[PDB]
């Protein structure tokens, strides 16, 4: 918000969360497939 | 609904007696 250390703290949060987001894209792909795997468990 | 019972007992006996004379 400032030029102050507030954007430094926000930066570190931002940085780490960005790395996390990638991790989360993968978890979405599994979530979609799990639905078909449950249907498949029955067979 | 509406309270038909209070009104019907008084009307039925009285009206019927006049109706006897008036019509068959």
């Amino acid at each position: 918000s400032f030029l102050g250390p507030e954007p430094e703290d926000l930066e570190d949060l931002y940085s780490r969360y960005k790395k996390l987001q990638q991790e989360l894209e993968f978890l979405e792909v599994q979530e979609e497939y799990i639905k078909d795997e449950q249907k498949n468990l029955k067979k | 609904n509406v309270e038909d019972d209070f009104s019907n007992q008084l009307r039925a006996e009285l009206e019927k007696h006049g109706y006897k004379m008036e019509t068959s």
Binding site: L3, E6, P7, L13, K18, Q30, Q38, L41 | -
Partner: protein
């Protein structure tokens, strides 16, 4: 963070540019809500299959 208040101008030090970071976080914060919904959903399907 701050409600309002300019701290040493846009031009002088360049508060707006560093300042943009706080708004980029609004996007990650907006994402944090869906992650939670996403976590429950994944678990319900998993628990369902597992039994």
């Amino acid at each position: 963070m701050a409600l309002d208040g300019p701290e040493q101008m846009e031009l002088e030090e360049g508060k707006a540019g560093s300042g943009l970071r706080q708004y980029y976080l609004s996007k990650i914060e907006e994402l944090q809500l869906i992650v939670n919904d996403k976590s429950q959903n994944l678990r319900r399907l998993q628990a369902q299959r597992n039994e």
